[PDB]
Symmetry: D3
Subunit: 159 residues, 6 copies
Amino acid sequence: GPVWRKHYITYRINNYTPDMNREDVDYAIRKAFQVWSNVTPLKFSKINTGMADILVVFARGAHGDFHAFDGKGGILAHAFGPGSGIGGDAHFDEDEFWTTHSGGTNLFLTAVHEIGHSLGLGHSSDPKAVMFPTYKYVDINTFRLSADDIRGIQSLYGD
Amino acid sequence: GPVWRKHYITYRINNYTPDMNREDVDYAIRKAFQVWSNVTPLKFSKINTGMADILVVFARGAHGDFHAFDGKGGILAHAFGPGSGIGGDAHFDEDEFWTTHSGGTNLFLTAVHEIGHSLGLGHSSDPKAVMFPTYKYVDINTFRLSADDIRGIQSLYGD
Amino acid sequence: GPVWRKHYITYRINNYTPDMNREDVDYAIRKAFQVWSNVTPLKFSKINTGMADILVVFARGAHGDFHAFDGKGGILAHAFGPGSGIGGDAHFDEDEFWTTHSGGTNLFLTAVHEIGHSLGLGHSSDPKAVMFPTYKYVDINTFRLSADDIRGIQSLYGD
Amino acid sequence: GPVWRKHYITYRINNYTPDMNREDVDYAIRKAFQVWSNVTPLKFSKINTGMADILVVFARGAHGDFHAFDGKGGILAHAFGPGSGIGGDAHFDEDEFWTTHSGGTNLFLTAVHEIGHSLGLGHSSDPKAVMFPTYKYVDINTFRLSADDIRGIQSLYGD
Amino acid sequence: GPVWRKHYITYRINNYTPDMNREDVDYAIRKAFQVWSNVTPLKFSKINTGMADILVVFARGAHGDFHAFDGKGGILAHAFGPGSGIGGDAHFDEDEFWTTHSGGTNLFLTAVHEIGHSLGLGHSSDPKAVMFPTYKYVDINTFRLSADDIRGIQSLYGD
Amino acid sequence: GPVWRKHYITYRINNYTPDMNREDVDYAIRKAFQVWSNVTPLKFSKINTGMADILVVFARGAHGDFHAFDGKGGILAHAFGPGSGIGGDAHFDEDEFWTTHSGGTNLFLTAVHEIGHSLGLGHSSDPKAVMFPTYKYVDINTFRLSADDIRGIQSLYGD
Ligand SMILES: CN1c2ccc([C@H]3CN(Cc4ccccc4)C(=O)CO3)cc2CS1(=O)=O
Ligand SMILES: CN1c2ccc([C@H]3CN(Cc4ccccc4)C(=O)CO3)cc2CS1(=O)=O
Ligand SMILES: CN1c2ccc([C@H]3CN(Cc4ccccc4)C(=O)CO3)cc2CS1(=O)=O
Ligand SMILES: CN1c2ccc([C@H]3CN(Cc4ccccc4)C(=O)CO3)cc2CS1(=O)=O
Ligand SMILES: CN1c2ccc([C@H]3CN(Cc4ccccc4)C(=O)CO3)cc2CS1(=O)=O
Ligand SMILES: CN1c2ccc([C@H]3CN(Cc4ccccc4)C(=O)CO3)cc2CS1(=O)=O
Ligand SMILES: [Ca+2]
Ligand SMILES: [Ca+2]
Ligand SMILES: [Ca+2]
Ligand SMILES: [Ca+2]
Ligand SMILES: [Ca+2]
Ligand SMILES: [Ca+2]
Ligand SMILES: [Ca+2]
Ligand SMILES: [Ca+2]
Ligand SMILES: [Ca+2]
Ligand SMILES: [Ca+2]
Ligand SMILES: [Ca+2]
Ligand SMILES: [Ca+2]
Ligand SMILES: [Ca+2]
Ligand SMILES: [Ca+2]
Ligand SMILES: [Ca+2]
Ligand SMILES: [Ca+2]
Ligand SMILES: [Ca+2]
Ligand SMILES: [Ca+2]
Ligand SMILES: [Ca+2]
Ligand SMILES: [Ca+2]
Ligand SMILES: [Zn+2]
Ligand SMILES: [Zn+2]
Ligand SMILES: [Zn+2]
Ligand SMILES: [Zn+2]
Ligand SMILES: [Zn+2]
Ligand SMILES: [Zn+2]
Ligand SMILES: [Zn+2]
Ligand SMILES: [Zn+2]
Ligand SMILES: [Zn+2]
Ligand SMILES: [Zn+2]
Ligand SMILES: [Zn+2]
Ligand SMILES: [Zn+2]
């Protein structure tokens, strides 16, 4: 339902998980956004000062929004739909072991799903959709949005 | 507790339910606001561009705020008390069948209740209050706030 | 899913609401069960000693099962599906004002819905079904299960 | 609402917290039950084989009933009201540091409160009641039920 | 914490998912139990009449225990720890597409995890444990409990 | 995780509890903030007009954010971590009896804990920490942050 009313959207990485190197996090997040900007007129920019539209946060258990994570495994992250303040923010469960590979939980893949929410997409019932609520590792090189993801995101922002 | 610190309050209809015609939704919502402005110094205006104080959204199940609706029937909608960002926003469960009549769930009647929350009112224990938590259809022509609703809303904004 | 594996089912009224006379409660509950036994091979009997299959309880707020009621209005009651121990038990929110008429919340009508759950039925999306999650008063003399209710209950116990 | 329909009630200690010696746990629990049997016709017996009415369990986080504890501090324990199966069972959050003294969280004091629930008592609004929802250490030698606790428990079992 | 006090444990399949053939369900469930009996003195038997210790149920959304499933994906099932009545029961989200292969959600693999709970095991933080809260398909022929699973289950029942 | 990106932070008292005199509330809150500014470079100012970073609200039960309080005792208050809109806001359960002394629930002590959250601190497992989730009255004259509180708050804002 909720949707951003602009094409230029900014994000800021609030804090970094110690599981990966800082540049690994920056890259994974940037690639995740690119997946969506590739099929829409949306443009994403990372900022280090000022208020960003989408704040990326790594935290475990109770972290300030009354929706605590559950420890290692299970729920991997969550994000608010489009909006001011908390809207669009993406939170990643620090109790997970984030990685750039097939071990632990892949940050890039999870970020794609979460940003889908940040942009206004809900869960899909299509097994192939990145918005399907069940995580399944796939190499980044072969990862691709499903037609369902494309349709949904374009129904909101076009292109 | 929370209360708006101004008399001019704006609202924007984020998206429309397919259950009714667009103008039916605009009218029902406008009439709902008028019910409250009629007994206070508050003034409501609908805007189509810019940030509105109260955003009206139609959505089903999980819709971005971590408080998912429950399908047809039961919870019909929910709204945040006065505040910035999400504050004041009213969400209507799309799984309900919204109408301008006695069938399905009447949008106008439900909107009056929700806006009551948007303005800072909680649930009432008075069976006659629009803020009573149990829905009961009443023709719009004979609908009226109860003394309890009036007292509560005026204790906040006067007039 | 859950279903009783017998036709003779007993119920016991744990405690009585002070809103009505004891015999009014006994009658309303008995009539509610009869609505279901009328369209199935099920037989219900009220017992005053021993362990009943379905325990009827009146309570407010937190009452021992970790699913507290919400005060006057809103959720009126809840019940567990078929099973031993807590299974089948029906709890009625004492914060409601129970009646034998159109005022407050009608016990008989609510009990029919709850017993539907006690017998293994979930919510229906049919507006006419007693299992539809939205309460609407109807005189007992004209009340009747919808075809959807009948089909569902008979798919479980036949007749 | 729920209430036991007998005077002879048995309890069994499912497992022991490593925080205290086994006999310290047995004693604290026995003293907690005695607090209630002292003002009612109820009689409690500890059994080591067979099905007990009240099962005492020490566990952390998610422990099998879908109502997970919250780690050290905060919620200290919880218990189901009178009934078969899970009814009456008392669960103590293992993440707390249980003791026989003023340090950590006193098992005896907490057990008195929990057993109050096991017997059918809800929370009290009386600051002096053991059933008041806020924990406050008091030496066992000077601990005593409040008039509110007495009235409530006797309204259920007399004496 | 909770644990069964016997070696002979029975289970009964309450209802069957239409996703698979009846015999496919019976087999998958039987194999899941065998995984646990292989490393303990426990013995499992399927019964078709009478009260089973562990009831297997397939259901979607709200199904009678006040802990509704969430639709396709996400939470796949849940189960109560050892105990009478509801204790030990395993519920499988019918909104998932259950299979005997790598498509949809594998019943056998999920059942192994759930039965782990039914037997008294909680979630593990070991990525290799079947009790780790994140689902990952693995061919049944190569599936195996992790040392962590073995230790945990044997700490409860030995062998 | 979330953290304020400035040293000058403002707060505004939305409404006052009738339990204490207005000046008692202002003082208790001011002292609570001072506890934190004493060990960091942070500076807090109370404003009466305009948008404050941290809004202090007194409310009971359901109060507009979908996380209702629980009546007298138990949960005493809650607050959102650093952020715009609702971020940082502190809500105090009006069902508690707030005081400047050892009776009821001490506002100052509770406010120190809540502001800890407002500033970005989560719960501590150190029994001596003000951020430990279990309330324990201590005279204001002898109250002091624990080393754990200091370390945590300084890891975020330094000094
Ligand atoms: C790359 N893809 C991802 C990545 C992440 C997620 C979700 C999974 N998840 C688990 C979950 C979701 C919903 C309910 C319970 C558990 C998360 O928390 C957040 O990320 C789902 C999917 C589908 S996929 O195409 O395989
Ligand atoms: C016109 N009036 C309305 C309209 C809407 C509502 C509420 C009912 N509701 C159901 C509910 C509320 C609380 C808890 C459970 C279910 C909603 O969700 C939102 O609207 C209540 C009432 C009382 S009334 O005077 O008859
Ligand atoms: C006679 N009929 C009843 C009686 C009772 C109920 C439900 C309503 N309800 C409110 C509710 C349900 C679900 C979610 C929020 C609120 C209850 O709690 C229990 O009873 C629903 C219906 C449909 S009806 O044909 O009009
Ligand atoms: C000896 N007494 C106890 C012991 C235990 C408890 C409760 C407190 N508690 C915290 C709680 C309760 C409710 C909500 C949040 C937190 C528990 O979990 C279980 O025990 C309350 C009280 C009141 S007292 O007279 O001081
Ligand atoms: C074969 N294995 C299974 C099978 C099932 C499950 C869980 C997963 N799950 C998702 C979940 C769990 C907890 C929280 C959110 C989502 C379930 O619901 C039930 O089954 C976990 C695991 C770990 S594994 O070794 O790969
Ligand atoms: C002065 N100190 C306070 C003040 C307030 C609080 C918390 C307690 N609490 C109860 C609670 C917390 C978490 C879960 C259940 C119950 C609150 O709600 C808010 O304030 C904790 C503590 C630890 S202390 O050093 O003794
Ligand atoms: Ca997790
Ligand atoms: Ca944002
Ligand atoms: Ca981590
Ligand atoms: Ca929330
Ligand atoms: Ca609904
Ligand atoms: Ca708003
Ligand atoms: Ca609709
Ligand atoms: Ca529950
Ligand atoms: Ca109610
Ligand atoms: Ca029962
Ligand atoms: Ca009543
Ligand atoms: Ca705890
Ligand atoms: Ca029991
Ligand atoms: Ca412990
Ligand atoms: Ca699911
Ligand atoms: Ca069972
Ligand atoms: Ca299915
Ligand atoms: Ca409280
Ligand atoms: Ca704020
Ligand atoms: Ca008060
Ligand atoms: Zn979060
Ligand atoms: Zn998601
Ligand atoms: Zn919403
Ligand atoms: Zn409402
Ligand atoms: Zn109940
Ligand atoms: Zn229902
Ligand atoms: Zn428990
Ligand atoms: Zn309690
Ligand atoms: Zn279930
Ligand atoms: Zn699990
Ligand atoms: Zn709040
Ligand atoms: Zn806290």
